[PDB]
Symmetry: D2
């Protein structure tokens, strides 16, 4: 069983770049034929064992009976790549190429959402950086609740698709969008802070369940498979009376330490906001007594995560436009020294006459948050010194949302 005759790779034994199109030729290709890569690399000098990866499905761009076009992937080191035709069980070697390094930079960079031009813009990167500054966001202009999973070199967020809110990943390497959910279930919110996963609260049926929607990214066949369907084995829960899905998802939810309780905020019809807690075992409940002009959940990562119990302090940024608490207050959500109930603590930071519009975390730091104010200002708060520190390069900032990412 020879799969194809007079076959090969046009670019055989040449050096090719991540993102390039490689061409395969031959007689006898069939509908459903797939293409696999095997990678071999040496990071420094060659030693046994080397670095190995395979089989990794190749993205097929064009397809005919006389050949096919495939795309070379990013995110591998410089590699000897062997290209195989895969017909069900069988594999046949077509040829080899040398693939130039496609590893993504690991330094954290700040990105802003430009709603005027509908673009993601790189707002800050540390010195000796100038790759490519802007990404077109016009395929999903409503991109919302934007967050980063460390090392993915792209952004996760919510956007309208088939009449509901769904999670997408924007890949910085290609500028392409990848759906993260298998089914078309409406998504209340993304949830960050677990440690090394992005979760989402989605409508599994009559009610809402907690899903892992980043598992397709943290996995070696990402290129050909990104949609996940991983709900928790817990019951579904309805929203409390009065509340509707459109009231959620403007800001990411946050896992409390232990990852059992999730902090959300909901926007009421009259423009006021309430804190809302979610327990995947018990459901939704409103944290009573607070109705403010803006509420954003946050967390401080008190140690570096490992890609295990991720240690953190979480809370709500609470903003009032007027009165005795005019401005933005940052208050931790912690259990009472008396007993079980979760109570909002007195503020550890308060900024009168300033409105917080975005919060995000640089994960190569510990115990800090990065905040975007308007009167625009970008500033870090360090938990251990209890002091703010402004970014002096970043006063223009024509953005309502910014996000740290690598």
């Amino acid at each position: 069983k020879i799969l194809v005759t007079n076959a090969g790779v046009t670019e055989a034994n040449q050096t090719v770049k991540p993102g390039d199109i490689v061409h395969i030729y031959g007689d006898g290709f069939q509908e459903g034929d797939q293409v696999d890569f095997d990678f071999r690399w040496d990071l420094g000098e060659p030693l046994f064992p080397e670095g190995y990866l395979g089989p990794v499905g190749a993205e097929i761009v064009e397809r005919h009976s006389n050949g096919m076009s495939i795309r070379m992937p990013y995110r591998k080191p410089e590699s000897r790549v062997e290209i195989f035709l895969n017909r069900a069980s069988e594999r046949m070697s077509l040829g080899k190429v040398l693939l130039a390094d496609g590893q993504t930079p690991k330094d954290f960079r700040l990105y802003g959402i430009n709603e005027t031009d509908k673009t993601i813009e790189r707002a800050y990167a540390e010195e000796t950086v100038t790759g490519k500054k802007t990404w077109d966001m016009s395929a999903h202009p409503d991109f919302r609740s934007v967050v980063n999973l460390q090392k993915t070199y792209g952004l996760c967020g919510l956007a309208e698709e088939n009449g509901v809110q769904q999670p997408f990943f924007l890949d910085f390497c290609t500028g392409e969008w990848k759906a993260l959910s298998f089914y078309d279930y409406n998504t209340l919110a993304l949830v960050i802070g677990s440690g090394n996963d992005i979760a989402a609260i989605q409508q599994r049926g009559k009610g809402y369940s907690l899903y892992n929607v980043s598992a397709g990214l943290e996995q070696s066949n990402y290129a050909t498979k990104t949609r996940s369907n991983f709900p928790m084995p817990e019951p579904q829960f309805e929203l409390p009376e009065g509340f509707t899905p459109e009231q959620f998802g403007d800001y990411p939810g946050v896992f409390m330490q232990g990852n059992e309780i999730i902090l959300l905020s909901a926007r009421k019809g009259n423009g006021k906001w309430v804190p809302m807690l979610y327990n995947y075992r018990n459901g939704f409940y409103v944290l009573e007594g607070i109705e403010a002009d803006a509420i954003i959940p946050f967390y401080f990562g008190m140690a570096l995560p490992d890609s295990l119990l991720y240690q953190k302090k979480v809370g709500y940024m609470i903003y009032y436009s007027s009165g005795d608490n005019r401005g933005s207050s940052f208050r931790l959500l912690e259990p009472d020294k008396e007993s079980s109930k979760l109570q909002l603590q007195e503020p550890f930071a308060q900024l009168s006459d300033k409105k917080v519009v975005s919060i995000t975390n640089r994960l190569d730091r510990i115990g800090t948050i990065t905040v975007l104010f308007s009167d625009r200002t970008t500033s870090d708060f360090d938990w251990n010194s209890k002091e703010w520190t402004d970014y002096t390069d970043l006063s223009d900032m024509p953005y309502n949302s910014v996000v740290w990412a690598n």
Copy 2:
């Protein structure tokens, strides 16, 4: 694009066992359609994040236009498994099953090769063990140079296939044989002791190169892909004058610490044996001055490996049937206190009137080897105490080769 209509899984929402056949039905299946699994598991109590795996190709056993039979895999924990039809790009969910635990036992067990019945036999396991004792070896009755890669729950070795020696993996879960090399190149020897890989010296063309032949096992799509083609980026080397491939491979080669030099032994036409060293950068050379009646390379693992620099002492067991050194001597190969050259050290252990016929390592111990003698006896040597300790259960042992494995 709905792939198939009136489709599903016969065993949908039921509990199935690893090794079972699951049936898929529907109208519109096509040649080349594949099937993918996504796994979700909770080892203890459920917490976010859970355990996830996917896509993992399913082995397809039977195939028609109205449906297909697939085999459920071993080596995953108890999992919710979602089954997808994969037609090139597209995926469609067919159904879900609960897959019972398929994790393999991690305790080290001793296995012997029975050349009379052509079977692998479990010779020793520690208390409270009685699973399944024997495996049929008749598909490859010449199975040779048998070794284990820790945690694979099976045995690697050499056997004749298409007129040459090639590496195979015998899977203990199924009793099935998997080819480890993609091409049909003759294999001089398997090489163990790197830390977490099995290598092989194979004829890449005019000469011999060093390959990694276990990479297909240490990889999540093992079930549908096991053959590797991973030579080192080093030149090919011919054997020294006089020597031929049939003289090698009776015993596994051993990596010295640093994994640059490999110890081999070769059998001459007259029944004598010589030590032979191999450097993947420089080629083959005979360690001069020794011609004995049996030579087996060995290593001591002086720390537990991590699945990084694996620390060890290596050498040759040298056996003479008569004379002043009658019996089996164990001598380390180390560099001279004077300069570079590798010299055989004086023995650290010597057994007169006993012939060593197999050596193997239990990797949950440190600094020991396990040895099989004939006058049969099985005994451990502990480097730190310099003492032998016999296994009292294991005097019968109708085997010439035994191997520790998990």
Copy 3:
């Protein structure tokens, strides 16, 4: 500032064994002078970096103005040991010795408490083992609630000291007892199952707090410092009305997954037993509705711990001497599929006409417990197969408590 003159080590440049006495001589020693070790080792062949340890305080056995006797420690590899005189700030090298390997065997072994002879006995070890079988327990004949912290090569438990129950470590290497608590506070119980620590509930003042009492063992100056004082920063709690300290501590408590809730059992005056839960944030509460003839908490470790979130299923073994539930029932404690409250589940294993008197865990296995019955029988239950498997070597067993240890 030369500390001492005409000084040295009697055994300078010689090979010495762990446990040996080494002698130091010189003029000018002072009260309070200490002795430090620096260790250098090569596990396999020498490479940079080597293995290093230092300063490690030496145990001083005898002391005079003309010299001192020190004990060489166990638990290091074969090492070049440099011996330093330490006078406050200053250090002076006295000499060097070669210390033979003192690493303790890592294979799990079963030990029984012999109350007749007041001895710890090795009841089981796997083949090729015969070191030293018995340890004298007469210094603490009431040694109770015996458990192992993996890799410590000794046993932790409770014994009477200064009129109260306190934690001790019996070191297998020396047969010597080490106190684990700094203060003389009464100990209700040891608590196991956290992952890599032994906790204890102790009377910090008016009430009880949770302590870590193994931290002194998991620390490189263990030889000279073992007593810890590490309470949690949580309030103290009294026992519920009626209960008294003498009712606790016969069996180790067990951490539920997440390490927030602890399972205990308490013996009433009339010989009946009740389950008692402890929350370090909220205090003690009786798990109502159960009054049995014996109750022992247990856990299954569902993955190997790392020395992170340790995954497990925990519960109570509940024994009744008569009636519809005659015998020993094993029931998990889990939260209801309905809501928050912790409920005892229906049994996953039940043994009529057999009384469980000890439960313990072999941590190189996953998902098993080891149980000791009387009609004596020793048997493993495997969570994944739901089957018992008896140890056929272990029917005599003149013990009420057995413990797995390495």
Copy 4:
């Protein structure tokens, strides 16, 4: 045996800062009494187990019979610290304090040596940084061959002490100098690139041996013990004829991958430079055929190190003031594709009319070096893109040596 009466800590139960003096009082203190700390911390919310450390020797600043002054250490998180009096065996608790966070920032920062003012200056740190900019270098104004061990928050280098070159650590937290060698042996050079250790070539006796001189820093009692004495168990080697110690140490040596061969450069009397290799098993040898106007060894770290086999490409920067190779050439030292001998490769980067005066590595990047030129310019070379990238903030730079550090 009560050690001291009417004793306590002046600052008992108060919050104190790293670097502060804490006072201990009482009657009956003795010469040689030491003081130990035990630390307990919770990074996020409290959970069992917490973070623990102890015993950690306290630095004693003042000492009398009625009390003592101790310094509170840096580099721990915010901790409950219990303070113990240590008299030989015995310990007594004196009191407790709350120690504010002393963790050092982990972001890499660039530091320059100012030979005019004799100061270490912080030349670059990324945004939102302004701690303390300058450190006084006047205690060792000849500080030379300056390097960083990651996470130490200070600088290692060579300086004159007792008539010879010796390694010192300058601690950024305190500005204090710590000796790294126990004995007063002349040091040819520091050697970097092993992965997580700083080595040094030092005169052990008649000849030179390889030492680990950073082990005292990577160790929890660093505060009271920094001097190491850890030579390799290899013979001593003399320098080749003609060469003298004053010709070495201007630049750090570099370990080749595998850490067996070390690259050095030596300055001749006439101002010319030669490459010199060192093998700890075989000794020194000149890499013949090269005599240049400046030579600096370097390495590229091709992966992040783990604090295992550190992968890297190493070589020599070779500078000529005139001729066909005017300027600075960067050439790897690799083994020939033909055989064993180490040959200088053709340059991978060449800068005509620019002189390299310092090279250093930012270890949160991979595959880069940072270089300081004069015509001053600071620039990164990225191995994977083969492109330079200048730091635009750093043109003034009144330094001959700069170093990346955290």
